[PDB]
Design a protein around this ligand. Structure first.
Ligand SMILES: [Zn+2]
Lengths: 29, 1119
């Protein structure tokens, strides 16, 4: 059903998904 | 430096002696071991033409070719012991250098077993033989005949440090005892005190405090025979007092112990710049956390404020404060290669021992941090620390520590509900365990000498492995096996404690057995008991599982406050057990159209037990269950409890972040600390710490804003419940809180939350369809289902309580009935006649519907069926089309599972401005920052010339760039990047310098800007992040949400617009274009929420890519 109407629809889209502290310097003794 | 000197002088003796005579070979062997000592930490090969291992091997061969004179036996013993010791040191240094080179090549976790695992049986024997020789030297009455006993003492120190690194504390105890013997025979009173303190420290870390006290005074006695002015005296006395404080913390003498700790901290000696003190600070910072883990009942209030005043708010901060100091000391001593793959050792005796000591302390601190952080709910941070520790252990090639840091990671992976990785980690360990000695370490005799069974560390590793294995069994659905594994853990822990007790007595040679058993394995038993009780909850048929509850209760209560969070878990289990109409309905004022008294007291006790440092899940379950058992009996208490059950890990992270902020030493910072502190309140009964602290916080809402909480009340810890709690908190408004049980209706609260996941899976499946006919059919079949769902929430779940969400009518019109419909409703059957439920609904009286009125009447009025409805219906009908509503922004708060349902499109909340904040303390900290001239966006507005965009970071989406190229470029005063992945400097600048951040791409850009960089800056720009699941807090198991939004809000982000589920290109592009033109064309002073509510109608599928954008924060606008 609506197969002939779905022909006029646009091509499918694509998804928006990838689908893939510093130690301080202590003062010397 | 002493390199070239010793090099040349040792060579002098190398050429100065012959070798044929028995004395000559001996002398050459000694000269060769001194040469190995230099070649082991200095590069002179080109000038020596020898390698450390070759030199030491020749020395060993010569030494085993020597026969003594029956009077120089001791000196040969010492020389052989030192030769073996330096063979081990040089082999370990070669291992470390080649591991550093390996990391240089590769820049994993498969080398955990790749360790040759064949030298670990000879390298350990080297140290074992060294210890045997040194013992044979120093366990006899006659004075040792060694030439130099100072070097023997130093070498024993290095042996103790190395044995602590390799995770063999038992033998380190013997090494330190021989050190004490050498110290007494050499009449050095400083080394005896130092040795005695390490013997105590090691003993308390294991868990036997009686012998620890014996050794502390043994140290205190030695403290008197030395001068009272030198740095040594100050440091040793301070250490003795700190150990006394820790002992009183262990011996239920907290009151005086805290005074000793305050004296220790206040003494300026623990500030002077010295490596010995830098180490001392670590011990005090650990002891501050042992006190900070205590409840508010085992102390006074004044001592608690005194301890918190200097710093260290939550225990987690103190331990991170320690791991930082430890890493800094490592950088000072052993360069930086051992920590990162991106300085000379300078061996002068003290440095050698301190190196191994600091490595061991780093590993132990990481272990404690992982355990505690994973307990609270911060699993990600625990995994980070675990990975760092695993890398460090892999570099050193020590199998036991890798095993502990592998079972910890497995436990965390189980917490995140990732069965495969957890199983792999548990299997990597069975390999290491097999090398060290289906699980084969089981079925061992209760008493044996197995390496996995004679070492406490390995026994703990095995027990934790079995515990996590039982957990992974239970998660997979294969029960029985998991329950048996947990029984094995519960049986094995006490016998392991018994073996450790016997071992300690064997090592220390005390007559009387330990008065107090070790408490190192108590946490394992408590966790096992928790798991058994939780499993018994879902299988009420069994009685053994039922009695377990009592056994765990006595186990946790018998040691207070050693195991408080486990006591709280078992108390919540006990209360939910006694729970199973609902007794809750008799505590609120409405129902859908004693035992409880004791339950509430037990929950109150548990609340006190964990309020200061609460685990997230446990607190949320408790707070809401206490709200269920209380209801309108004490409306303030119910509101407090409900608002204390959402976003707890968020608050932990914010307190830690605030400590970092203050460390990088202002008034707003201090008041925010007071707001988020889990203990900033006066002491007293239940109200003073709970209802009052609550009211103190509740008197702070900004006037004109409604704060609702939608917490899904649970039914059993772990699963989504079928009761929902709602609290409308407002200024000058008493808390109005009710229940909306959906488990008695047609669309249960789990049906909606499972249909959401079904639609998500359908979308993920359709995402890879080529046929336009098939793809478009799926999209148009999912949009209808999402449209059905958004109205289910309004039709079935909220029911007759959307008025409590819609701005309540503060007009003087509700008053006519706020007492009229009580004098008859109470007479017709009302149990708890509340008075606010009749004023929170009058707004939009015309919008009130007769079927809404029917439920509002039946619930408010039980018993007599005629008046029950008739009166409420005629009264509300008489009050129809009364007035018009004002403007009052709304900040709905939702729980971990109710955050993903679209609650914004609900056909009652469409016109009104609606956002979503993590909690309530956030809402008030917003006002604190808003009053101290901070968060400039909420002060002036969003400048329309201060926006930064990141479009198409990777060349994948041609349609996007094609649409938004000139529009995003021509915009006046904007800057951004298109095509190329922005550099880190640029993106940090955007969120910090500008005011708006439009992201068009994949995800939220967690590739070019992670939450870590965002937390390390302050956010001055509203985040409009338009990518799939850009504002979705992924519920990876029972854990709370996680995402970039929960780290923009902590940076001070005013608002945060991100999609909740995945989106395609064209529809989200239409949404973005609509919102931008609507908001940036409206003009000065234009609410963002209003134009979002308008841009929702731009996408073609107006419910699957139109209802996705949600907002996090406080209202934003232009100037
Ligand atoms: Zn065994």
């Amino acid at each position: 059903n609506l197969d002939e109407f779905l022909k006029e629809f646009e091509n499918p889209e694509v998804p928006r998904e990838d689908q893939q502290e510093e130690p301080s310097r202590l003062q010397e003794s | 430096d002493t390199g070239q000197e010793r090099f040349n002088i040792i060579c002098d003796l190398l050429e100065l002696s012959p070798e044929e005579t028995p004395a000559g070979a001996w002398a050459r062997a000694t000269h060769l071991v001194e040469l190995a000592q230099v070649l082991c930490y200095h590069d002179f090969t080109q000038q020596t033409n020898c390698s450390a291992l070759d030199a030491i091997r020749e020395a060993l061969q010569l030494l085993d070719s020597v026969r003594p004179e029956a009077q120089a036996r001791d000196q040969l013993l010492d020389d052989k012991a030192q030769a073996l010791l330096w063979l081990y040191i040089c082999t370990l240094e070669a291992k470390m250098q080649e591991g550093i080179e390996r990391d240089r090549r590769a820049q994993f976790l498969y080398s955990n077993i790749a360790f040759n695992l064949a030298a670990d049986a000879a390298q350990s024997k080297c140290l074992d033989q060294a210890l045997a020789l040194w013992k044979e030297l120093l366990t006899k009455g006659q004075a040792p005949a060694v030439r130099c006993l100072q070097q023997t003492a130093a070498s024993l120190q290095i042996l103790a440090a190395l044995y602590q690194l390799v995770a063999k504390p038992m033998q380190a105890l013997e090494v330190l005892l021989l050190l004490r013997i050498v110290s007494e025979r050499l009449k050095d009173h400083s080394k005896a005190a130092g040795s005695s303190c390490h013997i105590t420290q090691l003993l308390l870390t294991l868990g036997c405090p009686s012998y620890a006290q014996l050794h502390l005074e043994e140290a205190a006695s030695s403290l008197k025979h030395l001068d009272q002015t030198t740095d040594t005296y100050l440091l040793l006395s301070l250490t003795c007092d700190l150990l006394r404080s820790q002992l009183y913390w262990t011996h239920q003498k907290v009151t005086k112990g805290v005074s000793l700790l305050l004296s220790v901290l206040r003494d300026p000696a623990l500030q002077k710049s010295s490596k010995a003190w830098y180490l001392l600070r670590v011990q005090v910072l650990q002891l501050v956390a042992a006190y900070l883990s205590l409840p508010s009942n085992n102390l006074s209030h004044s001592l608690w404020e005194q301890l918190c005043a200097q710093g260290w708010q939550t225990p987690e901060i103190a331990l991170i404060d320690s791991h930082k100091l430890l890493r800094s000391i490592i950088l000072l001593l052993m360069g930086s290669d051992i920590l990162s793959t991106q300085t000379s050792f300078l061996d002068y005796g003290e440095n050698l021992v301190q190196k191994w000591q600091v490595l061991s302390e780093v590993l132990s601190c990481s272990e404690k941090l992982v355990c505690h952080l994973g307990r609270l709910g911060s699993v990600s941070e625990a995994k980070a620390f675990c990975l760092e520790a695993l890398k460090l252990t892999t570099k050193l090639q020590i199998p036991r520590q890798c095993a502990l840091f592998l079972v910890l990671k497995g436990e965390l992976e189980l917490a995140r509900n990732d069965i495969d990785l957890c199983q792999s980690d548990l299997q990597q360990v069975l390999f290491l365990l097999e090398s060290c000695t289906i699980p084969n370490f089981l079925s061992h005799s209760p008493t044996c000498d197995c390496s996995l069974c004679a070492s406490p560390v390995l026994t703990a590793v095995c027990l934790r492995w079995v515990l996590v294995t039982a957990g992974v069994r239970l998660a997979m659905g294969h029960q029985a096996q998991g329950l048996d594994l947990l029984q094995v853990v519960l049986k094995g822990c006490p016998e392991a404690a018994e073996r450790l007790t016997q071992a300690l007595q064997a090592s220390l040679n005390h007559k009387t057995p330990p008065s107090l058993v070790p408490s190192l394995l108590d946490e394992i038993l408590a966790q096992a008991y928790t798991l058994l009780a939780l499993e018994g909850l879902n299988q009420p048929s069994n009685e053994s599982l039922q009695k377990v509850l009592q056994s765990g209760l006595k186990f946790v209560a018998a040691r207070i406050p050693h195991l408080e969070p486990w006591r709280a878990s078992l108390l919540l289990i006990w209360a939910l057990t006694k729970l199973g109409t609902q007794l809750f309905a008799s505590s609120w004022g409405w129902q859908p159209p004693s035992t409880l008294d004791s339950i509430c007291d037990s929950l109150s006790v548990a609340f006190r037990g964990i309020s200061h440092c609460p685990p997230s899940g446990l607190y949320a379950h408790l707070c809401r269950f206490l709200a269920l058992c209380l209801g309108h009996r004490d409306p303030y208490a119910t509101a407090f409890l409900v608002t204390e059950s959402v976003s707890i890990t968020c608050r932990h992270q914010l307190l830690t972040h605030l400590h970092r902020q203050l460390s990088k030493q202002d008034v707003p910072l201090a008041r925010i600390q007071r707001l988020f502190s889990f203990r900033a309140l006066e002491s007293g009964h239940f109200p003073q710490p709970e209802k009052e602290s609550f009211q103190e916080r509740l008197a702070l809402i900004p006037s004109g804003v409604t704060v609702c909480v939608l917490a899904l009340a649970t039914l059993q810890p772990g699963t989504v419940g079928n009761t929902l709690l709602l609290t409308r908190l407002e200024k000058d408004s008493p808390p109005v809180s009710v229940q909306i049980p959906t488990g008695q209706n047609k669309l249960h609260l789990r049906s909606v939350l499972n249909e959401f996941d079904a639609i998500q899976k359908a979308q993920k499946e359709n995402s890879s369809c080529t046929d336009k006919r098939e793809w478009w059919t799926g999209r148009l079949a999912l949009d209808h289902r999402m449209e059905v769902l958004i109205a289910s929430l309004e039709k079935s779940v909220l029911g007759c309580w959307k008025g409590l969400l819609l701005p309540s009518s503060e007009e003087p019109g509700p008053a006519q009935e706020a007492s009229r419909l009580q004098e008859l409703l109470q007479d017709c059957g009302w149990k708890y006649p509340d008075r606010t439920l009749l004023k929170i609904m009058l707004s939009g009286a015309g919008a009130l519907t007769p079927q809404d009125i029917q439920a509002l009447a039946y619930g408010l009025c039980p018993t007599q069926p005629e008046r029950a409805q008739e009166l409420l219906n005629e009264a509300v009908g008489r009050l129809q089309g009364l007035t018009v509503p004002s403007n009052s922004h709304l900040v709905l708060v939702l729980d971990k599972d109710l955050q993903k349902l679209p609650w914004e499109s609900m056909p009652s909340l469409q016109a009104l401005p609606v956002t979503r904040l993590p909690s309530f303390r956030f809402l008030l900290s917003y006002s604190i920052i808003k009053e101290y001239g901070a968060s400039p966006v909420l002060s002036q507005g969003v400048d329309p010339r201060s926006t930064f965009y990141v479009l198409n970071p990777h060349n994948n989406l041609s349609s996007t760039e094609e649409q938004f190229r000139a529009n995003f470029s021509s915009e006046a005063g904007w800057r951004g990047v298109v095509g190329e992945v922005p550099r880190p400097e640029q993106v940090q600048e955007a969120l910090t310098k500008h005011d708006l951040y439009i992201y068009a791409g994949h995800g939220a850009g967690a590739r070019f800007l992670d939450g870590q960089a965002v937390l390390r800056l302050s956010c001055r720009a509203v985040a409009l992040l338009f990518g799939s699941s850009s504002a979705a807090l992924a519920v990876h198991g029972n854990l709370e949400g996680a995402g970039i939004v929960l780290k923009y809000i902590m940076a001070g982000c005013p608002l945060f617009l991100g999609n909740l589920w995945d989106v395609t290109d064209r529809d989200i592009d239409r949404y973005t274009e609509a919102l931008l033109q609507g908001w940036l064309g409206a003009g000065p002073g234009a609410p963002l929420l209003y134009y979002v509510n308008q841009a929702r109608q731009a996408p073609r599928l107006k419910y699957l890519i139109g209802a996705a954008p949600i907002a996090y924060g406080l209202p934003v606008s232009l100037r």
